[PDB]
Amino acid sequence: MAAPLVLVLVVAVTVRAALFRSSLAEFISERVEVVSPLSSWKRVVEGLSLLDLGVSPYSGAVFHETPLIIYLFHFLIDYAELVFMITDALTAIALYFAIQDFNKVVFKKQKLLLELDQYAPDVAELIRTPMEMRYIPLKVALFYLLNPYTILSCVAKSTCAINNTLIAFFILTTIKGSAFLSAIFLALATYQSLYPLTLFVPGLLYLLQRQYIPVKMKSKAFWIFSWEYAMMYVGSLVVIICLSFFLLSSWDFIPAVYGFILSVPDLTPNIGLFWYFFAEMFEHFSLFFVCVFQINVFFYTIPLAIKLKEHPIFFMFIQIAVIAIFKSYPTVGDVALYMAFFPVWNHLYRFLRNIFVLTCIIIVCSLLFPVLWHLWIYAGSANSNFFYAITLTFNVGQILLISDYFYAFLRREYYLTHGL
Amino acid sequence: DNETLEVHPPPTTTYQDVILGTRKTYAIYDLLDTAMINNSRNLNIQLKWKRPPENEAPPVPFLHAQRYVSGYGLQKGELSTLLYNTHPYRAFPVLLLDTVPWYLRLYVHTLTITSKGKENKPSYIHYQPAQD
Ligand SMILES: CCCCCCOC[C@H](COP(=O)(O)Oc1c(O)c(O)c(O)c(O)c1OC(=O)CCCCCC)OC(=O)CCCCC
Numbered sequence: 001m002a003a004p005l006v007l008v009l010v011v012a013v014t015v016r017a018a019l020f021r022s023s024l025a026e027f028i029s030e031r032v033e034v035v036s037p038l039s040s041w042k043r044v045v046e047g048l049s050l051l052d053l054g055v056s057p058y059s060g061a062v063f064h065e066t067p068l069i070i071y072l073f074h075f076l077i078d079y080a081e082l083v084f085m086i087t088d089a090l091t092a093i094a095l096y097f098a099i100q101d102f103n104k105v106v107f108k109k110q111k112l113l114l115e116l117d118q119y120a121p122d123v124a125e126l127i128r129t130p131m132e133m134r135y136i137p138l139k140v141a142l143f144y145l146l147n148p149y150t151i152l153s154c155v156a157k158s159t160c161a162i163n164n165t166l167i168a169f170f171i172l173t174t175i176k177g178s179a180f181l182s183a184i185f186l187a188l189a190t191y192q193s194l195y196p197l198t199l200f201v202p203g204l205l206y207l208l209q210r211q212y213i214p215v216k217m218k219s220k221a222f223w224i225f226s227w228e229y230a231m232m233y234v235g236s237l238v239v240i241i242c243l244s245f246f247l248l249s250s251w252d253f254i255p256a257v258y259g260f261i262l263s264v265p266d267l268t269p270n271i272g273l274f275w276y277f278f279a280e281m282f283e284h285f286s287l288f289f290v291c292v293f294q295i296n297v298f299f300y301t302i303p304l305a306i307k308l309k310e311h312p313i314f315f316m317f318i319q320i321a322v323i324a325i326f327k328s329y330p331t332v333g334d335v336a337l338y339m340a341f342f343p344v345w346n347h348l349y350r351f352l353r354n355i356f357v358l359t360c361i362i363i364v365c366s367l368l369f370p371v372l373w374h375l376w377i378y379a380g381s382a383n384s385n386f387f388y389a390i391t392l393t394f395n396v397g398q399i400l401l402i403s404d405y406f407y408a409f410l411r412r413e414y415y416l417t418h419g420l
Numbered sequence: 421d422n423e424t425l426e427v428h429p430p431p432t433t434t435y436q437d438v439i440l441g442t443r444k445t446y447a448i449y450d451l452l453d454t455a456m457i458n459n460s461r462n463l464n465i466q467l468k469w470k471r472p473p474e475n476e477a478p479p480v481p482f483l484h485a486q487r488y489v490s491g492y493g494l495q496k497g498e499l500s501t502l503l504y505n506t507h508p509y510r511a512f513p514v515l516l517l518d519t520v521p522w523y524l525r526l527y528v529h530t531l532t533i534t535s536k537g538k539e540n541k542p543s544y545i546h547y548q549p550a551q552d
């Protein structure tokens with residue numbers, strides 16, 4: 001339901017189909033930055049072949065997908081390219097409509113606040129304006145589709161695309177206010193990747209902000225709605241878990257998926273901070289770092305909640321970024337999900353401290369990942385230290401980019417209250 | 421069919437039998453024979469043998485294998501084992517057992533058995549995967 005969004009979709013699917021049918025598809029699928037042990041098409045096909053052989057897919061160290069993935073790609077094993085085109089299109093559509101509604105809500109709040117005049121007089125080119133927000137949903141869909149990260153994730157046929165679609169539909173349903181569908185999609189995403197659980201905090205907040213329920217201790221309605229939403233979420237999660245048990249009639253997906261995400265036993269190189277750290281780790285003293293590095297992903301959810309209580313969508317963006325950066329086995333398609341949210345926050349492009357250098361660092365790291373990977377895997381010229389340094393630089397760039405956006409947002413809020 | 425190999429010490433006797441596939445014959449030296457080996461008649465069996473001309477050797481033993489690793493980088497490769505049936509009259513069943521030490525993560529959906537350029541589905545397939 002848009003004039004240029006359809007054109008964006010057709011260009012995206014054209015690019016993706018050309019890459020699928022090109023000779024780079026196999027190379028992209030074997031790329032280790034776009035493919036993790038949790039999001040590998042080769043591993044999905046391997047699990048299906050194990051089922052054909054009659055051996056359980058989780059009686060091994062190669063298959064770590066969920067039973068819903070098994071069920072879905074049992075039927076869509078032949079149409080996989082079309083399925084991945086469809087799921088990226090669905091992610092783009094969900095982001096488009098979610099951001100459209102969010103911009104409408106933001107302009108409504110800005111109008112209702114300018115009416116009672118809580119802004120300083122020295123604020124003219126600092127308020128969101130309808131002509132500058134007209135194409136923000138289109139730019140969100142454009143960043144989601146026409147960036148190399150999502151294109152590579154689709155061509156590699158990574159299930160991180162499915163995870164992105166689930167998270168985007170969670171965002172869309174939370175923004176539209178459907179608490180039940182919000183809980184269903186959040187449960188599906190948590191069941192898939194185990195790190196949308198933190199996203200439970202922003203969504204609820206936004207839901208409350210959409211119901212005009214005060215978020216405060218001495219408020220019965222807030223606790224009622226929080227309990228209702230939490231029960232919907234946990235019940236959906238447990239129902240999906242029991243159903244996934246019934247698919248194989250065994251609780252083997254539980255260790256092989258969630259304990260694999262939490263304990264990190266594979267050490268396959270990623271763009272993340274876990275693989276080399278846990279490859280070169282002391283035997284004793286290693287469980288402490290597993291614990292702290294897993295607590296890292298869930299650590300900022302509460303402080304960012306109590307600092308961004310009135311801004312649950314920026315809080316949701318920051319949480320998605322934190323999940324993408326700190327994560328066992330992150331693919332670069334997880335980076336794409338939060339990078340698609342940049343046009344939502346491009347009005348902060350006057351308080352961003354250092355955007356140019358950080359964008360340069362991220363681009364250089366992205367184009368150095370395959371190069372140095374070739375130089376220490378296929379060429380013996382380099383070693384694992386090169387790839388480790390590039391992962392460090394990429395992740396530092398991501399941290400500083402997210403911190404710059406968060407700082408710019410806070411500075412814009414302060415300037416909204418206090419004159420510049 | 422005659423003209424066996426020349427062994428210098430005259431052997432005790434000759435034992436002709438079908439040993440593996442072919443009717444091959446042996447010269448026997450019975451060490452528990454004081455005629456063959458006295459207290460001062462140490463036995464040094466001599467055998468005249470050199471690589472026979474190619475028109476005088478057995479062809480090939482109807483079955484041999486050759487395993488090797490495909491690919492050239494790290495992170496990926498193929499365990500491929502050619503196995504030959506040089507009998508031009510008889511198919512025979514062969515039981516192949518492979519043990520791979522769980523740091524070469526095998527992808528069993530990539531298991532191909534061509535055997536003619538066509539695809540040969542194994543009669544019996546068993547695969548236990550590896551736990552790290
Ligand atoms: C965060 C950014 C950089 C992270 C660490 C960089 O340094 C690590 C690598 C060294 O690559 P390498 O494997 O060729 O060299 C070595 C050996 O081959 C060897 O056998 C040893 O025993 C060594 O000790 C050894 O060097 C070392 O230990 C490195 C000592 C430096 C530690 C700093 C506190 O740098 C780069 O190449 C990437 C270039 C970086 C920018 C793109």
Ligand SMILES: *[C@@H]1O[C@H](CO)[C@@H](O)[C@H](O)[C@H]1NC(C)=O
Nearest residue numbers: 454455456457458459460461
């Ligand atoms: C060896 O044993 C037999 C009979 O004793 C015969 O060949 C010969 O007399 C013995 N001595 C020697 C040196 O061969």
